[PDB]
Design a protein around this ligand. Structure first.
Ligand SMILES: CCCCCCCCCCCCCCCCCC(=O)OC[C@H](COP(=O)(O)OCCN)OC(=O)CCCCCCCCCCCCCCCCC
Ligand SMILES: Nc1ncnc2c1ncn2[C@@H]1O[C@H](COP(=O)(O)OP(=O)(O)OP(=O)(O)O)[C@@H](O)[C@H]1O
Lengths: 52, 64, 46, 140, 38, 63, 344, 119, 459, 102, 51, 319, 98, 49
């Protein structure tokens, strides 16, 4: 992001539900959990134009 | 003082463009430049073709 | 000689000494840090 | 589909005047509609009559400008057969600005538009030739 | 003589709320100095 | 002093400047390649993280 | 405005942007924007006069439409993907809408016809904030999403701002409106460079701030908000001139000052990226900003205008408002060109 | 730009990695210029508050100067670090991908033809 | 080079803090010491040019300008010491500071290698001139004059900068003699042509042609002695030096990218020399004469011949000095009268018996009376132009004739008639102004004697 | 009622300096300052600068080698006149080490 | 006293000194190619320390 | 100091606004028993009396408190006005404006004294009372409508932001008695004023000043002998109430903002030194520069107060 | 879903037109703002409940609260305007053009 | 040479400024203009894909 105060403090306030497959309250998983879990794992370690 | 004012700075305000005036101006600003230019270009092309032929006596033209 | 000698009529020893002290401490911390960095740089690159 | 604006460069400067002129006149109408929409949304007048009158003034004006310009540049390219050289577009822009001045009743605007628009068109041609890109994309 | 310095006829072409009133639509009135209108 | 001094000074200066020119003319290319194919550390645009994801059962096998 | 209210509003204003930036969620960004909007309106409308109320209405309406548009963008992105953040896979119409909204929120053109009116209705100590702590979060949003933008319309917008701001500044006498147009132009420069290197927008913004804030301090001094009311500075306080002249020439961007450096390295980037035509337009139309800064330099320092007698009753008095940071920023603006590399 | 490079320790002024770089000898012209800036700023503040210049606010001037230097020092360290990092990453990428940079060895002026352009 | 600059950067605080009764003398004498020390550059034993760092350099084409500037500084000071006599000490101190900043900038630029540094200094030259002209004039149009000056200059500045960028990118560096050792040739298309333009247009707009000579008279008239001096002497020369140093790359374009500019320069020389006959305002006459000579300079710069460059430098230096001198004389005759007009004061030489011989010795140097660097330059340039074409001696001769005419017209409407009878305000000559005249002259003698210094690159 | 003029001091008068300091020089109205400044100008700018500058320059050596070169040309011409070579060959660089296309 | 007046005459000499010293420092930098050139490459005769 | 901080700390105003912390005016016409009356009032009520601000209030308050020279102070002349009005110089208006401004400075310092310590004050003619003179000038023809409009604009700008005065005494004496008192006093300038002048003053007073202000401040119209018997006035004022006015529509915080505005000795005059150009007051750059140079050459005004050395300050190299 | 969603987006666009074009009032504009907000809240809750996502539901609440407060301050401004002019019209705001 | 370059530039920029500051403070108009701009941007994107 812009000002990584959150990562500096090693905390999280909003970024723990920035997307779909985060930890839902009573373990009720969302619709496309698996496809998200694969998209993210392919778009991790690399940045942007590689993933696009 | 008034004579100097009228020769120096009272000119453009009271100036009103009209033909024969625009005409004389365009003449003085274009004509002679272009005449001199055709002259010089013709001369240079003459000199260039002459040299390309390899004729023009340039002996002693060491400093130019 | 005025009639209403205002705040500027005499100095503020508090801020004077405060500024001098903070300046001296800036100088000293600068020197200590610079010498530390010199030591460590020579250490890590011969 | 943008073809009505891209066809302008299917052939070089040359024939197809009936096409180049329609295109330039279309650009005239476009710029006229746009400027008129701005000057109607703002600085309004009394009646819709005078408003759309202003709009039509601007539109027909720009249409005639584009027509005259593109026509001059399709004609010079035919007669003075040095097409890619931009003096064609420069003379065309001069004729266009002169038409603008003949419409607005101002010799000064005529000559100013001549110079400015003609040089702008010549630079447009220089760009089309030397690949100078406008609205580029970032590649440092 | 001496350095000519500006005067009222020079400064009172700025007092108008806007320079260059070449149009008639520039017939407005200066703005107050305290941001209050009558 | 002598002329050789200014001579060798000029020489060192020219070396420096030519090397600078080389570095810049290479930096442009490097930055271009990075921005155009993301093969490098620079211009690593931000992607979604992968630590705030769950890998625990979800009350139903599917999803 | 009692102290508790003052403190809470100042806190919310200092907060809105901090959240808008430190948050990675577009909803939190929009929230911080609304914070700024709300917490600011009062500071505009404190005097409760008709002009202030009118300006408040204009400001609020425009920024409301803008915020709702950005919200539409975010929600469409949600439906499209699922994430609350922008990725490289969003239909460009959404980005274009986001950009229109951010522009209207900043003051860029042709979404700019509301900035001069408002900045004329406002006092100084709030116009300053309006220009220097509300154009930050909307710019951080872009700093986050610069890669995938539409350079075409970004550049058209920027250059349009250049032209319109300069052409309006040639006329406007009211120094508040002049400063507003200058802001328009400089933000145009920024948005022009943005999708190529953002640090340069950061730099242009910090520089415009460092030049603006001290000018507004020098104004707050006398509440002289007009040319014929500032020309009297050489008889009220003849000291601020040797710095005002410099700062205005800088804002213009004259080489030996610092205001030049931004335009310079920006043109450098645009030449690397083959945008020399728009670079030329920007560089050949900043000269009008330079013009209507020179025309105030004239009025103030290089020539002395007729004063007003009661200024003697004034001079008999004294004045100790002008704090240290004013001079500090003036200097660190004018005389810091030798330290451009250490700035990049 | 580079804020995503490998392990960009976030919001840390000077990583420990920036102790293996030669700090600036305090005689450095940039620091000296910042000192001059502090002095001139004190001068300007005095002349604005209508005070004797060059003989007043000595403590003020000292504070200005030393603050300016105490800042410039570490700011300059950070900038040196950034430039070192840029150069290092560039050389690393070059060593990774040589094919992108054919080491064209130019030809002599004998083999290459300099065309003519008289006068 | 710091040995030349640093002291010129110390004269400033010196001026600020020195007492009123002594600042004038102190700063003057020390500026003279600077002028003296400025001769170390003349130890050019061998052809290896001088290079002090990646940031500075000297050369045979630059050194003259450097010394001339460091020596025109104190003359500006002195000539600026009778007016503003009722202006406050702080104001006159500001004036001195502006003069000194001009000196320093001009030195740094005439020395620098990187054309971008050259450019930022070439554009920082303005602020002091604009100020000096607006805040110390004697008429009202000085404002419009300053505006014209500034904006002509910046319009020039812009495309120059853009082309410097294009270069810095295409080529690796901008340093001179590297531009030389790694120049190349261009496909000669409209792109490179507009590049040639964007590179020369600013230097030309500064060194005035016929088309853009307009901001010169207004400046030299509305502005005071020092601004007039520095304009007529250096702020023109900057364009010439830039063009010389930069044209090294644009070969061959300058063969056919010159005809219009040469034509304009010659025709303008002629028309302006003619106007110098019927121009009442003395300073305006002088300014148009300067235009007439700088046109020769330009015509000699373009065609790129060695004779031409040496003649350009000779005439450059000569005109600088001679124009400073003529302007001193004008100012002198003005402070006693307060009217620039030529026909008001007449028939002097009966009360200023000597001064005339400082009037005469100038004209003779304007109309190219030998043995003078003036005529040497005019003649070498006419030689180069004759070689470049046989139909330019015509214009050379017409100009020579019209000059031989108006120089004497000026001598004769101010020092040859019969004395008026209502000019009771004729305070006799001041030792100060006599000194200024002598100092502007003597160097002409010494350089007429030994000109090998003042030749240029090719010698 | 008709009109009024902006309050302004009147046009100062034209005066004479020689009426109060016939020892004038042109610089200041303070005679001692006049004297000392004109002596400074003259000395620092007629006794030192002009004289010592002219001296330095005139005794500069071989400016741009216009003497060493004459010497070298004399020697080379001797050498070549003796050895029979011509004084100037129309080709500068060795045409052997050079190589050309077809 | 008088130094407050007659001290100013110390700056310019000090400026010239500082200038020559700075040029000396620059020339001590760039020391590379001290004797590695191809037209002034000597043998460093004994007791003749480097340039 | 009185930044927001001292207020937050406790130095408020209501905590010392006690009884007789009021403000009064003693207006009338030229030679009524104004000063004797006001001094009696001040002695009886423990207030402080502020004399009639003239042409030297600023120069007497600031610096070493000595009547400055006329070039620095206004360039007006009351004697020259009484002798020669209608001239081509402008003394009428470039005197009235200066006097209005000095009266305003008076009122401001008075509100400062009050709001800092509830010790009340007594005022002679005030800014509310210094327009009848101008209206008389215009009705007689001494002055231009343009100058009158300038003055009314200055008033509209400054007058409001301040709080009107609690109590207003008006002494009604007509032209014959006023002239008798004049001649008794004796002065070759006062001796030349016109019965029509004084009649216009009286008319303007009794038409505008009384109704305008009976709606937002207490009024007390008294006569010659009822003034000669002051104590009655004291008891009237004491047993009088102070309803129907802004001074109770206020609280600590509006009082605070007002005190800051007042204490700011130029926020009072950035609307009186405004740029509207009239050849009456309008001064040229030459004159302005000469005068500023001379003033800053004076002793005690070269630098700020706590810095001028020659006068006899010290520690001038730390503060 | 898609049909109703496109229609809700159309309604948003219509409120946009309502705000960007006036008919000599201000409450109409503010009500069109409220219509925008309603459509947005609805689209967001729909997206959530269709994806079966839960943690993303607080967002409608948040933006609804913020729209409430925003419209509140807007009404306060409208009221100050009416009480200082005499009505809530729009053509009274011809000031600030100077 | 004055009516051509400088006075022409003067007249031109003067007229363009008269235009761009002939505006009156009416939101009923400013918003219509915003709307035209939005339409323009949408259409440009649509054409250019
Ligand atoms: C850059 C110049 C333009 C700037 C103008 C301001 C000048 C101020 C700076 C100081 C004065 C300029 C220095 C001039 C140097 C004078 C050179 C000189 O004295 O002439 C040298 C001459 C010897 O002749 P030379 O030309 O050297 O060699 C040929 C063989 N006879 O020997 C002589 O015969 C000299 C005759 C003296 C009588
Ligand atoms: N606004 C004004 N403009 C011109 N002159 C004024 C103005 N106000 C007062 N004066 C002059 O100043 C003088 C003030 O003297 P005044 O008679 O008021 O003394 P006082 O305060 O009443 O005390 P006492 O009358 O008991 O001595 C009057 O003679 C009057 O002419």
């Amino acid at each position: 992001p812009f000002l990584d105060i959150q990562k500096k403090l090693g905390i999280s306030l909003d970024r723990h539900f920035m997307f779909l497959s985060a930890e839902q309250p009573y373990k009720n998983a969302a619709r496309c959990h698996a496809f998200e879990k694969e998209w993210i794992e392919c778009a991790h370690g690399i940045g942007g134009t590689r993933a696009k | 003082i008034r004579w100097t004012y009228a020769r120096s700075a009272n000119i453009y305000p009271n100036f009103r463009p009209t033909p024969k005036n625009s005409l004389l101006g365009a003449v003085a600003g274009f004509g002679p430049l272009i005449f001199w230019y055709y002259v010089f270009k013709t001369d240079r092309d003459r000199k260039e073709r002459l040299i390309q032929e390899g004729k023009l006596d340039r002996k002693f033209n060491i400093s130019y | 000689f005025y009639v209403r000698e205002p705040v500027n009529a005499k100095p503020n020893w508090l801020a004077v000494g405060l500024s001098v002290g903070a300046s001296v401490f800036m100088w000293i911390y600068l020197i200590q840090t610079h010498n530390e960095d010199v030591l460590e740089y020579k250490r890590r690159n011969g | 589909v943008k073809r009505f604006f891209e066809s302008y460069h299917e052939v070089p400067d040359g024939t197809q005047c009936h096409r180049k002129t329609y295109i330039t006149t279309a650009l005239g109408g476009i710029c006229g509609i746009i400027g008129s929409a701005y000057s109607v949304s703002l600085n309004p007048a009394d009646s819709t009559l005078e408003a759309v009158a202003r709009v039509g003034r601007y539109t027909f004006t720009a249409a005639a400008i584009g027509a005259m310009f593109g026509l001059t540049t399709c004609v010079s390219a035919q007669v003075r057969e040095k097409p890619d050289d931009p003096l064609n577009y420069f003379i065309g822009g001069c004729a266009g600005g002169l038409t603008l001045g003949a419409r607005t009743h101002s010799y000064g605007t005529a000559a100013m538009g001549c110079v400015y628009m003609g040089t702008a068109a010549a630079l447009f041609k220089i760009g089309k030739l030397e690949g100078w890109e406008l609205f580029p994309t970032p590649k440092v | 003589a001496r350095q000519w310095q500006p005067d009222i006829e020079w400064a009172e072409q700025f007092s108008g709320a806007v320079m260059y009133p070449s149009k008639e639509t520039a017939h407005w009135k200066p703005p107050p100095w305290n941001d209050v209108d009558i | 002093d002598g002329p050789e001094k200014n001579y060798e000074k000029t020489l060192a200066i020219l070396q420096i400047e030519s090397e600078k020119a080389e570095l810049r003319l290479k930096e442009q290319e490097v930055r271009r390649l990075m921005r155009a194919r993301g093969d490098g550390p620079w211009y690593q645009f931000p992607t979604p993280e992968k630590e705030f994801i769950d890998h625990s059962p979800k009350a139903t096998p599917d999803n | 405005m009692n102290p508790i209210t003052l403190a809470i509003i100042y806190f919310t204003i200092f907060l809105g942007p901090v959240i808008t930036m430190s948050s990675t969620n577009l909803m939190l960004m929009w929230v911080g924007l609304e914070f700024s909007l709300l917490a600011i309106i009062p500071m505009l409308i404190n005097k409760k006069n008709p002009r202030s109320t009118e300006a408040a209405t204009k400001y609020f309406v425009t920024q409301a439409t803008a915020s709702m548009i950005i919200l539409l963008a975010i929600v469409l992105n949600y439906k499209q993907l699922g994430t609350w953040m922008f990725q490289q896979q969003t239909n460009g119409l959404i980005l274009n809408m986001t950009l229109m909204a951010l522009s209207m929120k900043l003051g860029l053109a042709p979404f700019h016809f509301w900035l001069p009116e408002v900045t004329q209705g406002i006092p100084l100590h709030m116009g300053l904030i309006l220009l220097t702590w509300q154009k930050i979060a909307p710019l951080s949003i872009l700093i986050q999403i610069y890669p995938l933008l539409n350079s075409t319309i970004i550049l058209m917008l920027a250059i349009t701002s250049i032209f319109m701001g300069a052409w309006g500044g040639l006329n406007q006498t009211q120094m508040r409106k002049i400063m507003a147009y200058s802001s328009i132009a400089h933000m145009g420069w920024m948005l022009a460079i943005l999708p190529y290197n953002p640090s340069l927008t950061l730099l242009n913004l910090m520089i415009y701030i460092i030049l603006t804030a001290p000018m507004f301090m020098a104004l707050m001094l006398n509440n002289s908000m007009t040319i014929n009311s500032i020309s009297l500075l050489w008889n009220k306080t003849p000291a601020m001139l040797t710095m005002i002249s410099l700062m205005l020439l800088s804002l213009g961007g004259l080489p030996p000052l610092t205001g030049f450096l931004p335009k310079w390295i920006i043109i450098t980037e645009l030449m690397k990226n083959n945008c020399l035509i728009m670079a030329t337009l920007m560089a050949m139309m900043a000269l009008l900003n330079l013009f209507f800064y020179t025309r105030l330099i004239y009025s103030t320092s290089l020539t002395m205008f007729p004063t007003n007698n009661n200024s003697k009753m004034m001079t008999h008095q004294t004045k100790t408002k002008p704090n240290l940071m004013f001079s500090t920023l003036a200097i660190m603006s004018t005389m810091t060109l030798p330290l451009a590399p250490q700035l990049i | 730009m580079m804020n995503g490079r490998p392990g960009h320790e976030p919001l840390k002024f000077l990583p420990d990695e920036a102790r293996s770089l030669p700090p600036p000898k305090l005689n450095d012209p940039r620091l000296v210029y910042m000192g001059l800036l502090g002095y001139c700023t004190g001068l300007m503040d005095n002349m604005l508050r209508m005070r004797p210049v060059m003989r007043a606010g000595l403590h003020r001037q000292l504070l200005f100067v030393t603050s300016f230097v105490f800042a410039g020092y570490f700011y300059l360290k950070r900038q040196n670090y950034l430039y070192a990092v840029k150069d290092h990453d560039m050389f690393g990428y070059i060593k990774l991908h040589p094919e992108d940079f054919p080491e064209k060895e130019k030809k002599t002026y004998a083999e290459i033809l300099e065309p003519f352009h008289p006068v | 080079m710091l040995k030349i600059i640093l002291p010129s950067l110390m004269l400033l605080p010196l001026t600020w803090l020195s007492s009123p009764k002594k600042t004038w003398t102190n700063v003057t004498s020390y500026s003279f010491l600077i002028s003296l020390t400025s001769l170390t550059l003349l130890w050019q034993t061998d052809e290896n040019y001088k290079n002090f760092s990646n940031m500075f350099s000297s050369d045979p084409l630059s050194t003259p300008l450097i010394i001339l500037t460091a020596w025109l500084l104190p003359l500006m000071l002195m000539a600026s010491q009778n007016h503003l006599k009722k202006d406050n000490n702080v104001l006159q101190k500001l004036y001195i500071s502006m003069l000194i900043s001009l000196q320093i900038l001009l030195i740094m630029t005439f020395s620098a290698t990187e054309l971008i540094m050259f450019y930022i200094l070439f554009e920082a030259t303005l602020i002091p001139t604009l100020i000096i002209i607006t805040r110390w004039g004697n008429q009202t149009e000085r404002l419009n004059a300053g505006i014209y000056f500034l904006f002509y200059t910046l319009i020039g500045s812009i495309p120059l900068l853009i082309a410097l960028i294009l270069i810095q990118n295409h080529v690796g560096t901008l340093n001179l003699m590297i531009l030389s050792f790694t120049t190349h040739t261009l496909d000669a298309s409209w792109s490179n042509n507009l590049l040639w333009l964007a590179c020369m247009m600013a230097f030309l707009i500064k060194m005035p042609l016929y088309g853009v000579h307009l901001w010169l008279p207004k400046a030299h008239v509305e502005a005071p002695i020092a601004g007039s001096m520095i304009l007529a002497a250096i702020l023109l020369k900057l364009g010439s030096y830039g063009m010389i140093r930069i044209s090294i790359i644009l070969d061959p374009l300058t063969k056919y990218m010159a005809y219009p500019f040469i034509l304009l320069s010659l025709w303008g020389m002629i028309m302006t020399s003619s106007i110098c006959l019927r121009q009442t305002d003395l300073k305006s006459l002088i300014a148009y004469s300067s235009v007439s000579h700088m046109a020769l300079v330009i015509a000699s710069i373009m065609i790129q011949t060695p004779w031409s460059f040496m003649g350009a430098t000779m005439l450059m230096i000569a005109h600088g000095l001679t124009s400073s001198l003529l302007f001193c004389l004008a100012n002198s005759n003005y402070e006693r009268i307060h009217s620039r007009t030529m026909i008001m004061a007449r028939g002097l030489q009966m009360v200023f018996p000597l001064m005339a011989t400082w009037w005469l010795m100038a004209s003779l140097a304007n109309l190219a009376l030998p043995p003078s660097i003036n005529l040497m330059g005019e003649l070498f340039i006419t030689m180069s132009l004759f070689s470049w074409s046989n139909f330019t001696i015509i214009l050379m001769g017409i100009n020579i004739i019209i000059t031989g005419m108006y120089s004497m017209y000026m001598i004769i409407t101010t020092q040859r008639g019969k004395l008026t009878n209502h000019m009771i305000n004729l305070q006799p000559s001041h030792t100060r102004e006599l000194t200024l005249m002598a100092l502007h002259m003597i160097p002409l003698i010494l350089l007429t004697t030994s000109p090998k210094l003042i030749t240029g690159l090719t010698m | 009622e008709p009109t009024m003029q902006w309050q302004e001091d009147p046009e100062p008068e034209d005066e004479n300096v020689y009426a109060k300091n016939p020892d004038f020089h042109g610089y200041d109205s303070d005679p001692v300052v006049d004297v000392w400044n004109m002596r400074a100008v003259f000395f620092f700018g007629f006794s030192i600068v002009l004289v010592f500058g002219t001296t330095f320059v005139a005794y500069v050596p071989d400016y741009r080698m216009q003497e060493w070169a004459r010497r070298e040309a004399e020697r080379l011409v001797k050498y070549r006149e003796v050895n029979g070579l011509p004084i100037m060959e129309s080709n500068y660089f060795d045409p052997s080490k050079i190589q050309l296309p077809e | 006293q008088l130094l407050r007046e007659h001290w100013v005459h110390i700056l310019v000499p000090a400026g010239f000194v500082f200038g020559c010293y700075l040029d000396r420092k620059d020339d001590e930098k760039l020391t590379a190619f001290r004797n590695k050139s191809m037209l002034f490459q000597r043998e460093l005769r004994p007791n003749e320390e480097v340039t | 100091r009185y930044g927001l901080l001292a207020a937050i700390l406790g130095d408020k105003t209501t905590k010392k606004l006690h009884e007789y912390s009021r403000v009064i005016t003693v207006d009338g016409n030229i030679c009524s028993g104004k000063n004797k009356l006001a001094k009696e009032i001040a002695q009886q009520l423990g207030m402080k009396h502020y004399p009639e601000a003239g042409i030297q209030y600023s120069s007497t308050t600031t610096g070493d408190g000595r009547p400055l020279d006329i070039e620095f102070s206004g360039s007006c002349s009351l004697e020259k006005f009484y002798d020669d009005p209608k001239s081509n110089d402008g003394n009428s208006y470039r005197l009235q404006s200066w006097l209005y401004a000095s009266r305003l400075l008076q009122y401001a310092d008075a509100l400062e004294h009050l709001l800092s310590t509830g010790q009340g004050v007594v005022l002679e003619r005030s800014i509310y009372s210094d327009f009848v003179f101008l209206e008389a000038m215009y009705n007689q023809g001494y002055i231009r409508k343009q100058c009158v409009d300038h003055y009314n604009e200055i008033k509209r700008l400054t007058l409001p932001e301040y709080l009107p005065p609690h109590a207003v005494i008006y002494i009604d004496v007509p032209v014959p008695e006023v002239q008798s008192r004049i001649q008794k006093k004796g002065d070759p300038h006062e001796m030349k004023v016109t019965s029509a002048y004084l009649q216009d003053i009286e008319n303007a007073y009794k038409k505008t000043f009384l109704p305008k202000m009976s709606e937002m401040c207490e009024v007390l119209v008294y006569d010659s002998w009822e003034a000669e018997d002051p104590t009655k006035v004291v008891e009237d004022i004491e047993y009088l109430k102070y309803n129907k006015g802004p001074w109770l529509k206020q609280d600590d915080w509006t009082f605070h903002y007002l005190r800051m505005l007042v204490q700011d000795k130029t926020e009072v005059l950035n609307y009186t030194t405004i740029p509207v150009y009239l050849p009456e007051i309008t001064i040229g750059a030459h004159q302005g520069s000469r005068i500023y140079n001379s003033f800053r050459e004076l002793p005690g005004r070269k630098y700020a107060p706590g810095y001028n050395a020659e006068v006899g300050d010290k520690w001038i190299w730390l503060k | 879903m898609p049909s109703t969603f496109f229609n809700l987006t159309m309604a948003f666009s219509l409120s946009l037109l309502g705000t960007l074009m006036f008919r000599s009032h201000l409450m109409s504009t503010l009500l069109c703002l409220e219509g925008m907000v309603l459509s947005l809240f609805i689209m967001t809750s729909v997206t959530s409940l269709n994806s079966n996502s839960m943690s993303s539901m607080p967002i409608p609440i948040t933006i609804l609260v913020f729209a409430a407060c925003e419209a509140a301050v807007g009404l306060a401004l409208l009221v100050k305007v009416s009480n200082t002019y005499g009505t809530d019209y729009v053509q009274n705001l011809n000031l600030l053009q100077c | 040479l004055e009516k051509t370059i400088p006075k022409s530039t003067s007249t031109l920029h003067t007229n363009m400024t008269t235009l761009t500051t002939n505006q009156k403070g009416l939101i009923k108009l400013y918003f219509m203009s915003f709307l035209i701009n939005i339409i323009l941007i949408i259409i440009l994107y649509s054409i250019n894909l």
